[model samples]
Every structure is written in C-alpha cells, then in structure tokens.
Target: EEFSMSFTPAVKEVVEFAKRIPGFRDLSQHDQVNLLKAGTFEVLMVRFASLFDAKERTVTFLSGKKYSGDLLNSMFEFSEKLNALQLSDEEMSLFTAVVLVSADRSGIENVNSVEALQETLIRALRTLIMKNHPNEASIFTKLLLKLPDLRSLNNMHSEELLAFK
Candidate 1:
C-alpha cells in the first residue's frame, strides 16, 4: 500500500525534475509524457540509489524506514556501483536527460528525432565527464556502460514490485 501510495509523488518529482532539463519542455506533449512514463523508474533508481548507504550497509525505503542490506542484496550492489561513479550534479542531470531521450518506448511519433536528442545528450555527457574527470580516462565510457546496468536493475526491480503488488 505504501509503495503504491508513493508512486504518484515519485512521478511528480520526476516530472518536475524533467522540466528543469534544457529543451525537455520544448518536446511535443505526447513525446514528453511518453518519455516520462517509460523512463521515470530508471531515473528514480539512479536518483535515489545514494539512499542505500554503502558504508552503513543499509537500505532506506521511500517510507523513510531502514531495512537490513541483506533484504535488498541486488539493489544494494547496484546502488554501491552507482555511488562509486562519483557523478557530479551536472553529469547526473545530463545522464538523466540521456536516459529519458534513449527510452525505447512505443508510440513515440519521431524515433529519429529522439535518437538525435539522445546523441546530443551523450556528447554533452562525454564532454562534461572529460572536463570534470581528467584523471579518469575511462569515466565517460564507464558511465555509458551503466545504461545497461540500469536497465537490468529496472527489470529486476519491476519483478519485485509486481510481486509485492
């Protein structure tokens, strides 16, 4: 019940966050809604993965309750790896935009347009990572690699959500 209750607020938060991304609001309404529908969960997962304290070895749910890390082993692992990336806020924002633009959702009116947008974001992310992380030569590549990891985590998390429902 609580997870279901939290869904709307979570979505609202994602939408508000999306509105802040440059050019997001300029998209056609249908594409905007479709992108949010398809990508909100993945964005949320990355946004809040930091809540899973790696040092403390604990997981905190949206309800503000702490659970043993053992209860969410895979989630903890995913969170730990994501946290290790040490993404700057700008990098995270661009990554979130990349995630939205890259969503493989149906009924999008302009697939080519979406792909173009994604390419732009990807280039921006690469540029930012290069500037911010001069010492880590492969940081941008590693960040791109995390896209698949996020998708895998999304699938696994979806199963858990459905089972709970």
Candidate 2:
C-alpha cells in the first residue's frame, strides 16, 4: 500500500511554513488559500529536494528505466541540479517562502499587495545568495527557472489525478 508515505503531514507542515512567511497573512484569507493550493507541491519540491541525491542511482523502472514513466525522471534531474546549488538551511527556507507566495494568484483580489510581497522576498533572497554564493550571480537566475519547472512538474500530477478518476 505504498508508493510513498504521509501526504497530510506534509500539507500540515506547508501550512505551518506558509503562515510563518512575513506578510503572508496580510492578504485576504481566500488569497492565502489560493496560494497554498497552487504552491504546495512546488514548495515541497524545494523542501525535500535533498532526497533526490545526485549520487543516488539513476532512474529505476519496473525493469531499469521511469512518474507516468517520466515524472520521476523529470524530478530527479531537476532535483539534482537544485541539490548541486548546496544552499544552506536558511537559504532553503527563504527559497521555500518565495515559492509559497509565488503561487498562482489569478483570482487574488489583492494582486498588488501580493506582488509587493513577492518582490520583498525576492530582494532578500538575492542578498543572501550574493553573500553566501559569491561569483555565481546566475545562481539566482537558475533559481527563478526552477520555479517554472516546479510548476511544470506539478502540472503533470494534475494530469495523473484526472487519469485516476
């Protein structure tokens, strides 16, 4: 009964982490829910990225090859690149905070407010990256790209869910 473990607890921690973000609660309650709904997997993607260690064996199939067959592979490559960044724990938390608030908010009524919050976190995160990861300014660029890829991976899960139905 296991392709895995513990979905609810992970969601709990996400909620707890989202609330801890500065200015996260300043927006409307509905906006908060919208962000969490859209960003849970993305944030967790950033959170447990270390689990997909680069040194780990390559993809394992039922035989030796693949989520749908590629979901897990997509995740592994993305995670390997991310882990290579070697961010400190504090950096990881800040990045996760950025991921949470960066969630899709097309329905948000306080769009301007949420936008401002994202800018603030982005600026702070850049400062830390500049300090700790000297000479790799493009690391910030790579992190930005990670966001899009994270959402793309989650998009595949959405397809998987509908297929299950």
TM-score of each: 0.80, 0.84
Candidate 2 lDDT over residue span 1-165, tens digit each: 123333446667789988989899998998999888788878866755644456665333222223224765676777789888888888888988888888877768888988999999999999999999889878888888888888888777745422321
lDDT of 1 by residue, 1-81 (tens): 535555557667788988887777777888888888777767877766756768677766666777653325766676788
Instruction: Please give the CA lDDT of all the candidate structures.
Output: 0.73, 0.76
Alpha-carbon error at 152 in model 2, in Å? 1.5
| Model 1 worst lDDT run, 10 consecutive residues | 156-165
Candidate 1 global lDDT = 0.73
Error of 1 at 4 (Å): 5.7
Identify the leading candidate in terms of lDDT: 2
lDDT of 2: 0.76
As a whole number from 0 to 100, the lDDT of residue 61 in candidate 2 is 26
